[PDB]
Amino acid sequence: ELMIKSSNAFDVIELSSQIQRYASLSKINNRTNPILKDNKAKEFKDADLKWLKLENCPTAGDVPTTGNNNDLQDQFIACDADYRKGDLSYFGSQFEFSTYVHPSNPEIQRQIKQVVSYFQYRGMERAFIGD
Amino acid sequence: TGNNNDLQDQFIACDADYRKGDLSYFGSQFEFSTYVHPSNPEIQRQIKQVVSYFQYRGMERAFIGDAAGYVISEAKKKGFSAQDYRIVLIEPDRVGYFESNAISYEEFIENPSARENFLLKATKDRTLALAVSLAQTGEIAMQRDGSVAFLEDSELCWDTAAGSAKSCLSVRYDTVGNKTELDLKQIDVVSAKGLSFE
Question: Could you please report the per-residue DSSP string of A52-117?
Answer: GSBTTSSS--SB---S-TTS----SS-TT-----SSEEEEEEEEEEEE---SS-TT--EEEEEEEE
Instruction: Please list, in sequence order, all residues whose beta carbon lies within 8 angstroms of the beta carbon of residue B168, skipping any fewer than 6 positions away.
Output: A26, B155, B156, B157, B158, B186
Q: Is B59 exposed, middle or buried (0-12, 13-18, 19+ CB in 10 A)?
A: exposed
Subunit contact A113:B164, Cβ cutoff 8 A: yes
Closest CA to B55 of B126, B112, B105: B126
Task: Provide the 3-class DSSP secondary structure of residue B67.
Answer: helix
Q: Does B104 touch chain A (CB under 8 A)?
A: yes
φ/ψ (deg, to 5) at A78 = -65, 160
Residue of A nearest to B163 (CA): A113
Q: Which residues contact B113 (CB under 8 A, 6 or more apart)?
A: none
Closest CB to B76 among A10, A30, A73 = A10
Q: Does B73 touch chain A (CB under 8 A)?
A: yes
Contact B99, B89 (CB under 8 A): yes
b/e A42-64 (16+ beta carbons within 10 angstroms → b): eeebebebbbbbbbbeeeebebb
Question: B33 in contact with A at a CB cutoff of 8 Å?
Answer: yes
Nearest-CA distance from A16 to chain B in Å?
13
Q: Taking CA B69 as the corner, what is the angle to CA B66 and CA B70, rounded to the nearest 5 degrees?
A: 100
The letter for the amino acid at B78 is K
Close Cβ partners of B123 (under 8 Å, ≥ 6 residues apart): none
CA distance B172 to chain A (A): 10
Backbone angles phi, psi at B34, to 5 degrees: -65, 135
Task: Report how many helices (DSSP H) and strands (DSSP E) chain B contains, helices first.
Answer: 3, 8
Q: Which amino acid is at B156?
A: L
Strand ordering across the sheet containing B166-174: B156-159, B166-174, B179-183
Sheet holding A88-99, edge to edge: A42-45, A88-99, A110-121
Q: What backbone phi and psi angles, to 5 degrees, belong to A69?
A: -85, 5
Helix, strand, or coil here: B29?
strand
A31 touches A39 (CB < 8 A): no
Q: Using alpha carbons, select from B157, B160, B171 the residue that is nearest to residue A24.
A: B157
Technique behind this structure? X-ray
Please state at what angle helix A4-23 crosses helix B64-77, rounded to 10 degrees. Answer: 60
Question: How far A93 CA sits from the closest chain B CA (Å)?
Answer: 18
The secondary element (H helix, E strand) that includes residue B197 is none
Q: Resolution of the deposited coordinates, in angstroms? A: 4.1
One-letter amino acid at B190 equals V
Cβ proximity of B35 and B48 under 8 Å: no
State the virtual CA torsion across A61, B100, B135, B82 in degrees, nearest 10: 100
* B153 Cβ under 8 Å from any chain A Cβ: yes
Q: Which among A14, A21, A72 is the top mutation candidate for probing chain B, defined by the most B β-carbons within 10 Å of its own β-carbon?
A: A72
Nearest-Cα distance to chain A for B198, in Å, is 24
Query: After which residues, if any, is chain B broken (C to N > 2.5 Å)?
Result: none
> Residue B109: enclosing H or E segment and its boundaries?
helix B105-110
Q: Which residue of B has its CA nearest to A69?
A: B33
Are A6 and B154 inside 8 Å of each other by CB? no
A30 neighbors A66 (Cβ within 8 angstroms): yes
Nearest-5° Cα angle at A65, B185 to B37:
65
